Amino acid sequence: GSSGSSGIEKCWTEDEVKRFVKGLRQYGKNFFRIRKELLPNKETGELITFYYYWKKTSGPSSG
Template identity: 50%
Template sequence: MNPSAPSEMSLWSEEECRSFESGLRLYGKNFHLIQLHKVRTRSVGELVHFYYLWKKTERHDIFSSKVWLEKKKYNLHPGTT
């Protein structure tokens, strides 16, 4: 069994979830950078494990919709803030 990805993961706080999503937006799937700069309370293995669970949730769907809209808005009006 891999010690970095425990079979039973402790619950993540709302702050950890938001930090994870912020890191994912900034660093993509570079879990080392997300852990280093955003979610220092979890190991890289826990981030990877959480990512695959998170992808199956409604929270991921909402995140993906927001990211897609942000990209679409930027493509329609590049350089505007």
């Protein structure tokens, strides 16, 4: 009945990532402003989530 699909999706570009890092390294903890100067068109949510995921609260584990 209810079927779905999946293909080429989009989440973050190379430019966005580059700027994000540059801002987090240059400024630091202030996405509120960093984003306003970097990606003012995007949403703070994307940055917050991205940072949390990029930080990986879990970290490296045994192997």
